[PDB]
Amino acid sequence: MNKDLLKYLSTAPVLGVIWIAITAAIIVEFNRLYPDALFFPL
Amino acid sequence: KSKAIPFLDRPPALDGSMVGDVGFDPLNISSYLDLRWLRESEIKHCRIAMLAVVGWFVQEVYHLPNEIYSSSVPTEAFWKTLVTGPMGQIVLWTSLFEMISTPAVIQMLQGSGREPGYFGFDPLGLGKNPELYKRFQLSELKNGRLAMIAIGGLIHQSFLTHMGAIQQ
Amino acid sequence: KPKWSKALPFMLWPQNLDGTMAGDVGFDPFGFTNVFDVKWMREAELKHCRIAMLAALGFIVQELWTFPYPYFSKVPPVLAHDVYVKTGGMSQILLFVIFFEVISLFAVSQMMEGKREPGVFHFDPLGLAKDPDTFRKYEWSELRNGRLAMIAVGGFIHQYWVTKQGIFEQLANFRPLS
Amino acid sequence: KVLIDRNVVPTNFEKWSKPGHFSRSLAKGPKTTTWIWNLHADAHDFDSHTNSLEEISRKIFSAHFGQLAVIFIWLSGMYFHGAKFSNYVAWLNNPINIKPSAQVVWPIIGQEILNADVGGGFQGIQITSGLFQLWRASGITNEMQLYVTAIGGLFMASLMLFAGWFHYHKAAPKLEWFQNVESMLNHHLAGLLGLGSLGWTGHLIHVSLPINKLLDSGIVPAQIPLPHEFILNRNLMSELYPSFNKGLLPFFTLNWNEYNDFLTFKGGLNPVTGGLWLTDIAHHHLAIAVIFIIAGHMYRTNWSIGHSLKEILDAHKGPFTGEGHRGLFEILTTSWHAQLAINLAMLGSLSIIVAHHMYAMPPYPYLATDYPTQLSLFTHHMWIGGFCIVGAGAHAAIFMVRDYSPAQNYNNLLDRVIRHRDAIISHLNWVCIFLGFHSFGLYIHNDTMRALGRPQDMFSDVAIQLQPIFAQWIQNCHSIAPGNTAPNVLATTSYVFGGDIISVGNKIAIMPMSLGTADFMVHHIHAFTIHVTALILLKGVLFARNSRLIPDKANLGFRFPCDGPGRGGTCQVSGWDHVFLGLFWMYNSLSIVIFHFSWKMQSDVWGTISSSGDISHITRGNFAQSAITINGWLRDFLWAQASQVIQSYGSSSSAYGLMFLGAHFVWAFSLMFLFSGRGYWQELIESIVWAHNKLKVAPSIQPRALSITQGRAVGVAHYLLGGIATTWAFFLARIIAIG
Amino acid sequence: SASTSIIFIVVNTICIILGKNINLAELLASMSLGHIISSATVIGLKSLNII
Ligand code: CLA
């Protein structure tokens, strides 16, 4: 893959957005599949 | 000068090169629009007219099967074939050709060297001889110029009347 | 190169079509290769060629034969799309097309860097074109068959939408339009 | 002449990983976090990147294609949401009893509550953009037509994105091309506006007219022929509009009166839909098309005929104005900022005209009795107008700092304005004080008198009257004009001036708006707030280059925080700082305009009618007696109408409750930036940096407090966002409940 | 009709005569102004049922 493009994908805002979006997705998907966890079940 | 109008002067743009140049441009529109553009347009009108003239006559005599194709009066033939299909096709396939022709007109004006009206269509090899080519070009233009006026009559006569040319 | 286009004698040979590639008869009137890279366009051309050829043959064979199980069961090709979306068979094909296309992403980037020729995957298991001259001959056939299949597939799908007949059903009867 | 340079700029990603490549100052890279902010702030300040006017012009032209691409994607999205995620078709069938919706939320963390019961078996967010009414007027009757329009939008977006790339990287026009202002005007008048209007007339006559006539007669949408049927089968048209039997012969022979069935001059409103007659709209567009195509033959291009703009300007000079308009042609063909200033002023002013004209002469079917849409459209277009006007001030000031020269402006109108700037600003200062006292002062008088139990001493309709007699007289002229000064018009331009109560369903579409003391008072508030906004912006422009306080201000530039604590203190002298202050006053001004609109319409226009004919207004005519004190606005407007938004939790309007609070938060947060200064913050950051250094986790890009100017920018941006979004939530929650 | 054509011939002729090889831009400009003036005249007279 093109090195200049890869360098662009490594810039702070691009990595910032991608990483936050993945994190946000993980939280969304946990809450979509295991909803309403007010506490750890034990 | 000007052979056609000997009392009026020659059109400045019309030097004496193109075929069918008898110095006929009273309005001198060749000074305002490019002559290659005008000739390209003239030949296109010629060739459409000539086909349309023979179309006018032959449609009287013979017809294809199906009621849509059976209409002696050429003006009436349009209406029954408009929404049906045939005129959709004629438009479509001529549009295709014109879409391909559009960039050729552009690069002519830029200066490719393409003469106006040349599509290089000579299967039988008529006008391979330079001498024959020239006289063939004049006749095309003469006959086309004549057909342009002729098709005008056929249509306008058919408006006045309500039959074809052979019927009238 | 021959100055005037071969396919269009009244138009100049496209400036960025050099005459060397297979399929080149100087046909680019709209001048796509003036602005876009020919390598990119050829990459695309061959991908469409190869997908269409598979499609053309698929349409033909599916109407003449299907696998002898009820899960398959004869349908018209165009309708089969929605049949197998429901079963999950179409998602399976999508799974492996995605896989190959994500890999191809790297191939296309390396092509644009000049490290790979458009359309080349070095795929010749049976070794039908070990000779350079047979390879160039077959390059032309691939393009010609591929270009034909691209249009042909257009025919099949549209004629079905109109006639509501298969390929061979229509050739058996051949009823004209209204 | 077409003048272009080819293959100018290579296309690769090399510079994408080199932030701030475009600027000499930024290309060296950061030493400090200030650099990160500067990168964004300077990205589109193209004339700060280069001195070449040609280079600047090329970037602008290409950026414009970028904007158009974005607008096509947005437009495409609206159509696609219409096709895929809306109750458009259901609404089409029953527009009085279905609320429009074209946004549906996914069921996550309980947010599906927001899918409201809008009717037609549908659940979704109720929209207020007016798209459904637009699409109905266009003759769209099914989701297929919306899908295809959406796809066409994506095609256009891609075409704009290509043109942007092409005209920057591959075929960039030369400066001489851009300076062809005579040719540009001819094409934009005749071509863009003229042919645009003619083309739309074509749609109206051939598609909108028939479909809407059939819809209004009560034909079911699915039973109406598709648009092309009306074109191919003329008899379908001639059934509806008999003049179509005569074809185009009346046009070419100037028997235009033959077309008086589909080209009308009715006035008033369609009684079925409560919108303007489409036959009037068709005639409007045909007339406009003709005028514009003629207008676009004014200027000289490649032939002998036409005017030179320079020659016109140079002739207009009189005994009061020195060299007159001499030198303006040079300004307006060498300064993009000067062009932007004019064009923002006019575009903004136009948006405001659109707001007023669309509520009073509702052009779409079922717009007038969609109260949420009426309120939303007026408010939206007022805001857009305000922001553009403040922008005009910004770009007028930038011109004065960067592009003005004395040699170009010797004793012309521009020079003569700046040579009496003290006379202009002193008088505007006075008129603002006068207006302030004699507008707001009347409310304070009234509050005091009513609190003291002296209603007889108030300015009111039932005490000391201040009747807007001139406005009342104009209303009367407009009401009697049909068949008089407008003899061939059948009905009023607007029922707002007088005449009938138009109703659709049992909802009032439009009716006469009485003007009394409360109307007089609020009009002088608008005069006041607009004059002050003008004062601030005008002062910024006229003192951008220098003042008695700072003789060399232009050398400091457009955007600088101050010139130090000396001379008494010089904070906020720059042109930029006048825009900053002007934004708050524009905000103040337009807030009162939209509040006036909201309350007046609910009190005196919108409501229900009985069969007997008894009007019941949403707030029951309380405006006359309540809108003449500040307490009345606080109580009968803010407190009373906030009941909807404030009681929205646990319902489909709960999003508005949340946005209302969220917007109050953002507003208050803005005050941290506006009231503080960076000296405090830079010191605080020093202690925090100490802790990071101690733990070996300090960044190499050193943390800095925001610049003085950025502090101000952040402050005003949060103030506006918070303030405007609060009103948005307030308005929508209210009007969706009661309207 | 004659009256329509007469007004057109006369008005457009005056536009050519007062317009001052031939210059086609000037001719087209003159005829265009002639059409505008002629159209408004005809339509006007028609409205007064004179023509
Ligand atoms: C590489 C591993 C792999 C695996 C595990 C699967 C698994 C499946 N495929 Mg998929 N598929 C694959 C690759 C794979 N596929 C590839 C490369 C393609 C070409 C794009 C497809 C195209 C495809 C289509 C069009 C469809 C499937 C379907 C299926 C499902 C059939 C369910 C069933 O009832 O089986 C029944 C199985 C048998 C009766 C036994 C068959 C034995 C064969 C030889 C398979 C064993 C292969 C084994 C994993 C590897 C080598 C074995 C060894 C002997 C050499 C199953 C989930 C179908 C589906 O979606 O059903 C709902 C379906 O319609 N696949």
Ligand code: CLA
């Ligand atoms: C398709 C690939 C492509 C590539 C590789 C290039 C490459 C280049 N362009 Mg070109 N350009 C392109 C397409 C492309 N462009 C298109 C489509 C346009 C029309 C807009 C342009 C118009 C253009 C201009 C006017 C300029 C360039 C310039 C450049 C150079 C610098 C770009 C840079 O560093 O900023 C990278 C910037 C970005 C990645 C951001 C772009 C943002 C886009 C345009 C809008 C985003 C949408 C929206 C605002 C998002 C909002 C989100 C929301 C949260 C608010 C670089 C050689 C500049 C130069 O200096 O050359 C000498 C320059 O001035 N380009």
Ligand code: CLA
């Ligand atoms: C008929 C001629 C014509 C037309 C229609 C336009 C239209 C436009 N020009 Mg202008 N322009 C023209 C001639 C024309 N120009 C000439 C001769 C010059 C040189 C003197 C310029 C120099 C110029 C500059 C420097 C700029 C413009 C810009 C614009 C856009 C302004 C923004 C807007 O209103 O969006 C309205 C949007 C639309 C109407 C949708 C897009 C329309 C596309 C481009 C096609 C329109 C024409 C097409 C032939 C119609 C198709 C008909 C169909 C039935 C087949 C607008 C698209 C600005 C711009 O935004 O550039 C990108 C800009 O900066 N123009």
Ligand code: CLA
């Ligand atoms: C056609 C309209 C138009 C155009 C083409 C320009 C063009 C320009 N402006 Mg002008 N301006 C305009 C309208 C316009 N402006 C309007 C309407 C105003 C009043 C607000 C101004 C006031 C103004 C000022 C005060 C200044 C400019 C400046 C500039 C120049 C640089 C802009 C830049 O780099 O910022 C890059 C863009 C950003 C940093 C984006 C910031 C986004 C803000 C905060 C709003 C976002 C809110 C969003 C809508 C909602 C919430 C988002 C969500 C994420 C929470 C550029 C020449 C600057 C200059 O120095 O010129 C020489 C300058 O100082 N403009």
Ligand SMILES: CC1=C(/C=C/C(C)=C/C=C/C(C)=C/C=C/C=C(C)/C=C/C=C(C)/C=C/C2=C(C)C[C@@H](O)CC2(C)C)C(C)(C)C[C@H](O)C1
């Ligand atoms: C200089 C020249 C002179 C000759 C000049 C002379 C007057 C020029 C003659 C040409 C003109 C008048 C013909 C006009 C022809 C106009 C066209 C060609 C008809 C278009 C109709 C369409 C096509 C629409 C029809 C449709 C309608 C809608 C009805 C529908 O039913 C279907 C169709 C059928 C399609 C002389 C005399 C001095 C001699 C000198 O030596 C050389």
Ligand SMILES: CC1=C(/C=C/C(C)=C/C=C/C(C)=C/C=C/C=C(C)/C=C/C=C(C)/C=C/C2=C(C)C[C@@H](O)CC2(C)C)C(C)(C)C[C@H](O)C1
């Ligand atoms: C140059 C050439 C000329 C030819 C020119 C001429 C005009 C060429 C034009 C051919 C075009 C129109 C082909 C168009 C191909 C259309 C495509 C292939 C359609 C894809 C359909 C999809 C694939 C369906 C998806 C479906 C849908 C949508 C939805 C689903 O539910 C179901 C499925 C089933 C998936 C000549 C004639 C002069 C001869 C000369 O010799 C040289």
Ligand SMILES: COC1=C(OC)C(=O)C(C/C=C(\C)CC/C=C(\C)CC/C=C(\C)CCC=C(C)C)=C(C)C1=O
């Ligand atoms: C006079 O008014 C003011 C200042 O001076 C004019 C200030 O300076 C500040 C202080 C504010 C600052 C310094 C800006 C805050 C910026 C942020 C949050 C830091 C940005 C950090 C990142 C992008 C990294 C985080 C990474 C991810 C989450 C992915 C305030 C409050 C202020 O009132």
Ligand code: SF4
């Ligand atoms: S307080 Fe700030 S803005 Fe004012 S003079 Fe001092 S440094 Fe400048």
